[PDB]
Structure formats: structure tokens, C-alpha cells
Amino acid sequence: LTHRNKDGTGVRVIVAGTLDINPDDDYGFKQEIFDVTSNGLKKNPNWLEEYHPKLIKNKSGKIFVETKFSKLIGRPPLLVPGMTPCTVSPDFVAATTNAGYTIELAGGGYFSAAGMTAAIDSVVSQIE
Amino acid sequence: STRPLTLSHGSLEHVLLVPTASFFIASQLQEQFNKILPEPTEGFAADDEPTTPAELVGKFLGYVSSLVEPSKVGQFDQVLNLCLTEFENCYLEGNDIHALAAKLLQENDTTLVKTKELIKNYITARIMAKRPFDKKSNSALFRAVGEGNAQLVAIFGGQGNTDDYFEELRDLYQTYHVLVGDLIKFSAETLS
Amino acid sequence: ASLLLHVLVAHKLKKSLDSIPMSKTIKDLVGGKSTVQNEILGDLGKEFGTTPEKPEETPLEELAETFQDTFSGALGKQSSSLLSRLISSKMPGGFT
Numbered sequence: 001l002t003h004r005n006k007d008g009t010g011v012r013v014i015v016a017g018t019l020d021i022n023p024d025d026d027y028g029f030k031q032e033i034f035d036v037t038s039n040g041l042k043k044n045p046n047w048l049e050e051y052h053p054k055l056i057k058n059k060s061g062k063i064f065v066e067t068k069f070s071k072l073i074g075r076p077p078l079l080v081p082g083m084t085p086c087t088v089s090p091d092f093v094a095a096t097t098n099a100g101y102t103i104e105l106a107g108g109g110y111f112s113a114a115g116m117t118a119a120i121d122s123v124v125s126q127i128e
Numbered sequence: 129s130t131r132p133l134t135l136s137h138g139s140l141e142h143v144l145l146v147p148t149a150s151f152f153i154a155s156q157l158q159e160q161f162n163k164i165l166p167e168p169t170e171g172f173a174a175d176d177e178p179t180t181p182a183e184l185v186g187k188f189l190g191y192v193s194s195l196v197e198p199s200k201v202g203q204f205d206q207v208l209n210l211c212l213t214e215f216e217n218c219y220l221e222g223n224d225i226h227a228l229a230a231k232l233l234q235e236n237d238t239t240l241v242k243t244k245e246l247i248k249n250y251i252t253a254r255i256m257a258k259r260p261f262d263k264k265s266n267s268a269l270f271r272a273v274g275e276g277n278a279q280l281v282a283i284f285g286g287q288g289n290t291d292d293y294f295e296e297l298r299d300l301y302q303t304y305h306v307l308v309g310d311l312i313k314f315s316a317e318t319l320s
Numbered sequence: 321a322s323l324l325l326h327v328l329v330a331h332k333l334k335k336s337l338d339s340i341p342m343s344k345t346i347k348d349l350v351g352g353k354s355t356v357q358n359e360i361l362g363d364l365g366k367e368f369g370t371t372p373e374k375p376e377e378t379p380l381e382e383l384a385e386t387f388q389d390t391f392s393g394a395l396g397k398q399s400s401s402l403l404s405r406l407i408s409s410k411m412p413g414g415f416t
């Protein structure tokens with residue numbers, strides 16, 4: 001009961017009264033008390049510290065919100081998503097990409113490989 | 129000057145090195161033990177029959193521990209003391225019994241009832257053969273609290289958590305008889 | 321899956337294969353003791369692998385389908401181990 005109240009604060013519950021095995025391995029049983037190896041000291045995640053948003057700079061000196069997602073793409077953690085009328089235009093996809101933000105070209109406004117390929121080519125021609 | 133003895137049940141065995149000084153005792157226990165435990169069946173699934181070498185040695189430690197006296201130095205004291213020292217050096221590799229009971233449960237096809245008795249047997253044996261727990265164990269968790277990594281808090285429950293709490297007192301007393309027997313006894317007197 | 325699930329639940333409740341109606345949640349059948357509830361969920365975890373979210377809130381009838389898809393007449397870990405006990409522990413005295 002206490003475990004579920006404070007999943008994601010960085011607290012491990014050990015049920016000191018019973019020996020069993022947790023498949024999830026969310027909380028411990030008696031073993032964790034007695035065990036001598038590193039399988040006695042296990043910690044539970046502290047989401048506020050694991051996934052704390054940070055800042056960070058280029059050689060250029062240009063600040064970024066650092067997160068799991070921005071660290072992968074090298075751009076701010078903001079995406080304009082695929083909208084059928086709105087991000088069908090390769091002139092919009094290009095402007096948003098140029099700016100420095102992630103954007104989906106929208107399949108939903110294209111009816112054939114030929115038609116989309118012409119669109120994707122019009123994007124590639126305009127971006128850096 | 130030693131001599132081999134082989135505790136076995138169906139397909140699995142532990143080979144046991146008895147000083148020949150006290151062999152005519154041990155071989156008499158071996159045959160008496162080898163008739164109580166049942167007919168080997170595939171998987172070793174039935175609750176009584178042990179499933180690993182580690183359980184078979186434990187089943188023995190229990191059967192021997194059931195013939196010793198805690199005061200009177202009998203014949204079986206040195207027999208038991210050289211089943212323990214085998215069991216502790218093969219299958220515990222300087223861990224706790226609980227850490228072993230866990231391993232068997234997620235590796236092998238043991239059950240809970242099967243692994244509860246192994247903990248009863250070993251902890252009974254440790255006390256029937258005057259080897260009381262006195263070493264400050266190297267528990268990873270408590271090495272970690274000394275160092276100042278881990279903070280611990282104790283919490284105690286109340287009524288509502290189970291239909292029959294009293295099965296918890298029965299299962300606790302069945303298994304740690306030899307550790308709690310004195311506290312139970314004290315409460316029974318103090319309430320009465 | 322609809323038979324296997326019924327049997328796994330029936331066996332854990334010490335109850336007959338028709339005294340459990342399939343149109344009923346797992347948290348309904350063992351409403352009292354919460355231990356048995358999770359212990360059933362632990363068994364379905366081993367048996368069929370991946371579960372829905374809050375499986376003890378969806379009727380066995382409804383939950384049997386969700387398994388029927390990604391499972392293929394496989395007895396797997398838990399059920400095999402329950403039969404291994406049933407035979408050896410009961411008295412098919414010699415015949416395994």
C-alpha cells in the first residue's frame with residue numbers, strides 16, 4: 001500500500017515478513033535484508049531526478065532545454081505534428097525545419113508515391 | 129582419515145565426507161532417512177520429495193536435528209556439524225539461507241512450501257548443533273546504511289490486512305520455532 | 321484460453337469448474353483476500369505472458385479473448401507445473 005502511494009519518489013519497500021519473488025521487482029521481499037551481493041541494495045527511480053529538465057550550450061553559445069528527446073535530435077523538445085491540411089505544404093515543412101524545430105510531412109494530403117515524392121523533393125530543395 | 133556416503137533420491141545426490149571415526153552412526157541414519165521420503169516421480173513435483181541437491185541435504189539436516197537433544201551431548205552432534213559445514217560451503221557460498229531459497233524459486237521448479245521447510249530445517253539445525261548466529265552478517269543493505277547511502281524506516285501494520293492473521297503466526301512459529309519459541313512463551317505467560 | 325483461464329482460476333480458489341461463472345471479474349471472486357487476487361494475476365502473468373491494464377477489473381469471459389489472440393494452445397510454465405504436481409502428488413501410483 002505504501003509502495004503505490006510513493007512509486008517514483010526514490011523509495012524501495014521491503015516486505016520484511018514474507019519470502020516470495022516479485023516479477024515486476026517494484027518492491028522487495030525478506031531476501032533483500034539478508035543478501036550479501038549487490039542484489040540487496042537496489043534503489044527505485046526518482047522520476048523528478050531521472051528526468052529533471054536541464055539547460056546546456058553550444059560552442060556557438062545557444063541554450064537548449066536538455067531532455068531525453070532533445071538529446072536525441074539536437075533540436076529543442078518542440079514538434080509541430082502531422083496535420084492534414086496544415087503540414088501537407090512543403091513550404092511550411094521547410095520554414096519550420098529552417099527555423100530549428102521538428103515537423104511531420106502529412107501523408108493524409110497525398111494520394112500516391114509519385115505525388116508525395118514530388119512533395120518530399122520540394123522540401124529537400126528548400127531546407128539547409 | 130575420511131570415507132564417502134551418498135544421500136540420494138531418484139536422479140540426484142549429495143556425496144558426503146564422514147570421518148570413519150563416526151560412520152556406523154551416519155549409515156544407520158542414511159537408510160532410516162532413505163525410507164521415509166517417498167518414491168521418486170518425474171519433475172520431483174510432489175510437495176514432500178526434494179527437487180535439487182540443496183533441498184535433499186536440508187531434508188536430511190531436519191531429520192537428524194529431530195533426534196538431537198539441545199543440552200545432552202548425544203552421538204548425532206558431530207554427524208550434524210559435518211552436514212552443516214558441507215551445506216554452508218557447497219550451496220550458501222557465504223550468503224544467507226534466504227538468498228539461496230530465492231535462487232531455487234526463480235531458477236528451479238521448487239514451490240513456496242518446498243522452500244519454507246528448507247529455511248526451517250537449516251535454522252533448526254544451526255541451533256540444535258550449538259552454532260548460534262553471532263557474526264554481524266555482511267548484508268549489502270546494512271553495509272550501505274553504515275556508509276550513509278541508504279536511510280531505512282521501519283513500519284508496522286494493523287487489523288484489516290487479512291481474513292486470518294493467525295495463519296501468519298502459525299507459519300512464522302512452524303519455520304522459526306527455534307528463534308521465537310522464547311518470545312511466544314513470554315507473551316503467553318504475560319497475557320495469561 | 322477460455323478453458324485454461326477458467327481452470328487456473330478454479331484451481332487457485334479450491335472450487336469447481338462451474339461454481340466460477342466466466343461473466344465476473346477476478347476482484348469479484350476473491351473480493352475479500354487481496355493476496356489470492358494478486359497470486360492469480362502472478363499466475364496469468366507466467367501462463368500467458370503479457371496482460372491488459374487492471375486485469376482484475378475486466379470479466380474472465382472478456383479477458384479470455386484478449387489472451388486468445390496472442391496465445392496458441394501452449395500449456396507454458398504455470399499449468400505444466402500444476403499437472404506435474406497433480407499426477408505425482410495424487411496416486412497414479414506408478415503411471416506418470
Ligand SMILES: *P(=O)(O)OCC(C)(C)[C@@H](O)C(=O)NCCC(=O)NCCS
Pocket residue numbers: 001286287288289290353354355
Ligand atoms: P488488496 O489490493 O485489496 O490489498 C490492499 C489492502 C486493501 C489489503 C490494503 O490496502 C488495506 O488493508 N486497506 C485498508 C488498510 C487497512 O486495512 N486499515 C486498517 C484498519 S484499522
